[PDB]
Amino acid sequence: RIKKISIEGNIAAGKSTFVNILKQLCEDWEVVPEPVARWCNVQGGNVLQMMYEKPERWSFTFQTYACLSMIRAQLASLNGKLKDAEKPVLFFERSVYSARYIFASNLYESECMNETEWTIYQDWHDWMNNQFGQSLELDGIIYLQATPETCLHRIYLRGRNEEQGIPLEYLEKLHYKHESWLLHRTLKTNFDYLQEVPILTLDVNEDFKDKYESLVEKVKEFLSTL
Amino acid sequence: RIKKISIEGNIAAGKSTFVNILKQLCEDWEVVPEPVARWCNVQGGNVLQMMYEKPERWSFTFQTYACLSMIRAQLASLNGKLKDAEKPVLFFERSVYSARYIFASNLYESECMNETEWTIYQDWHDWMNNQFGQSLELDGIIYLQATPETCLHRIYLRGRNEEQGIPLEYLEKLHYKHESWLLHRTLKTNFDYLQEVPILTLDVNEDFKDKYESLVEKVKEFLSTL
Numbered sequence: 156r157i158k159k160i161s162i163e164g165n166i167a168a169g170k171s172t173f174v175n176i177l178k179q180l181c182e183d184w185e186v187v188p189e190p191v192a193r194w195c196n197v198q199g200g201n202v203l204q205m206m207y208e209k210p211e212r213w214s215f216t217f218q219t220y221a222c223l224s225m226i227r228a229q230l231a232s233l234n235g236k237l238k239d240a241e242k243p244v245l246f247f248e249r250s251v252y253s254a255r256y257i258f259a260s261n262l263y264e265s266e267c268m269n270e271t272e273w274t275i276y277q278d279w280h281d282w283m284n285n286q287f288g289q290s291l292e293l294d295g296i297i298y299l300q301a302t303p304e305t306c307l308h309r310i311y312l313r314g315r316n317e318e319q320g321i322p323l324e325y326l327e328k329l330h331y332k333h334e335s336w337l338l339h340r341t342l343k344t345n346f347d348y349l350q351e352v353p354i355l356t357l358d359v360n361e362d363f364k365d366k367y368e369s370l371v372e373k374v375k376e377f378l379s380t381l
Numbered sequence: 382r383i384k385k386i387s388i389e390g391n392i393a394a395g396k397s398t399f400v401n402i403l404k405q406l407c408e409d410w411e412v413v414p415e416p417v418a419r420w421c422n423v424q425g426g427n428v429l430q431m432m433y434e435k436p437e438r439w440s441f442t443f444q445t446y447a448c449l450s451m452i453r454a455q456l457a458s459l460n461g462k463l464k465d466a467e468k469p470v471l472f473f474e475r476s477v478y479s480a481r482y483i484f485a486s487n488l489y490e491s492e493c494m495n496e497t498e499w500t501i502y503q504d505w506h507d508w509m510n511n512q513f514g515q516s517l518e519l520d521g522i523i524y525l526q527a528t529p530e531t532c533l534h535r536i537y538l539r540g541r542n543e544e545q546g547i548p549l550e551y552l553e554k555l556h557y558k559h560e561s562w563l564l565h566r567t568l569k570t571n572f573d574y575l576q577e578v579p580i581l582t583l584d585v586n587e588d589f590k591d592k593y594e595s596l597v598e599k600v601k602e603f604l605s606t607l
């Protein structure tokens with residue numbers, strides 16, 4: 156009965172900035188943030204650092220941990236007795252789909268994951284999916300669209316240590332896979348329904364300060380149709 | 382309503398040999414073998430080989446894959462509509478407990494897994510446990526006890542390629558952790574109930590040919606008490 160909407164975008168496109176705006180728009184809207192802070196101290200080791208420090212060594216470990224910690228947080232929001240409100244909406248920061256079809260797929264293609272790693276990752280992903288898939292199905296997607304170059308500047312502005320080494324090239328690859336999935340809708344997934352799911356594309360290259368009011372109307376308008 | 386019994390022992394103690402004997406003893410007994418054959422070809426890569434080829438690189442990947450593939454096979458035996466028989470018994474080849482408290486714990490202590498790897502492994506283990514723990518709870522344990530030296534000879538007899546490099550030292554460590562857990566019952570787990578679970582210890586150092594008949598009576602006797 157809970158509508159589930161995922162917020163997709165490249166690294167530093169402004170997802171957390173966008174997400175912090177939502178609860179104040181309506182009392183019925185809940186948000187499940189990406190556990191990024193938790194990833195840099197496990198329960199400790201900073202596995203997010205290890206990922207960027209040696210992707211050939213740590214991609215598989217990180218990517219599978221990232222996605223598991225996302226599943227758990229998302230499942231915990233569903234059980235989390237916030238079903239009782241009039242018309243409840245739950246925004247996911249990223250989803251199991253991008254975790255796999257964008258982030259993990261990209262590192263495999265960059266040879267940061269070998270065939271064995273990629274095969275085990277997928278096999279685990281599928282299994283996670285049929286156990287807790289139906290409950291996590293998306294009613295809609297919001298794509299915060301920004302150039303790789305803008306993202307690169309925003310990694311600098313935010314100043315998250317582990318991400319300061321990310322090159323433009325890495326962000327460019329993530330960009331084209333987002334565009335293939337969310338704009339051209341050309342990316343093949345194992346999930347039929349995703350190809351019909353409504354998608355709102357918002358251009359977030361300009362300052363959040365003077366686009367706020369318009370972005371909000373676009374979101375409110377988009378939700379009505381769902 | 383299904384009694385669940387796990388068969389524990391060191392590498393090549395004779396678990397599969399013992400297990401092949403059970404279905405013929407009673408029509409109501411089912412067996413969940415360790416998916417070892419599947420581990421040497423993933424769905425492919427031989428991740429069991431990689432584990433022994435470079436334990437510092439592959440222990441975490443293997444150990445977590447080993448345990449997941451064990452959970453799934455075990456859950457599939459429970460759902461697997463073999464509840465309809467008079468007094469059903471399900472034998473597990475090893476369990477989630479040894480996977481963690483013996484095999485994974487040993488590699489962490491040998492520095493084949495770092496703190497981050499060990500922490501993520503445990504955290505995933507716990508989470509797997511509270512999701513599908515209650516359904517997998519053991520009513521009993523059968524410890525096939527053999528000297529590390531006997532096991533070493535049996536790794537040679539069996540001739541499984543990936544395991545041909547295993548040194549005595551590795552088997553000795555596994556032996557003492559089994560003895561600590563199943564004989565002295567001194568090993569601390571996160572699972573209270575395990576410390577009260579009945580355990581049958583069978584000495585399997587002699588030839589299976591002239592101990593068969595006695596082992597069987599011991600098993601039949603043991604099951605009655607449960």
Ligand SMILES: Nc1ncnc2c1ncn2[C@@H]1O[C@H](COP(=O)(O)OP(=O)(O)O)[C@@H](O)[C@H]1O
Nearest residue numbers: 166167168169170171172309312313361362363
């Ligand atoms: N539309 C925008 N205009 C100007 N600055 C932005 C905009 N969106 C995000 N920022 C800034 O960029 C940085 C990264 O944004 P953040 O929301 O943390 O990204 P994400 O959550 O997508 O990784 C932060 O410093 C934030 O203040």
Ligand SMILES: Nc1ncnc2c1ncn2[C@@H]1O[C@H](COP(=O)(O)OP(=O)(O)O)[C@@H](O)[C@H]1O
Nearest residue numbers: 392393394395396397398535538539587588589
């Ligand atoms: N009690 C026994 N006496 C003689 N040979 C045995 C005995 N148990 C096992 N074997 C032999 O030892 C090898 C390893 O046994 P297996 O059942 O495959 O071990 P596990 O399943 O514990 O890894 C096989 O060659 C098997 O024929």
Ligand SMILES: Cc1cn([C@@H]2C[C@@H](O)[C@H](CO)O2)c(=O)[nH]c1=O
Nearest residue numbers: 189191218221222249254258318
């Ligand atoms: C969900 C996800 C995020 N990321 C990165 C990891 C962080 O740098 C950033 C968090 O916004 O996203 C991945 O590399 N893989 C992933 O699966």
Ligand SMILES: Cc1cn([C@@H]2C[C@@H](O)[C@H](CO)O2)c(=O)[nH]c1=O
Nearest residue numbers: 415417444447448475480484544
């Ligand atoms: C269940 C399990 C088995 N093993 C090993 C892997 C195989 O060599 C052998 C199968 O009988 O047991 C592990 O190293 N870790 C494990 O968690």
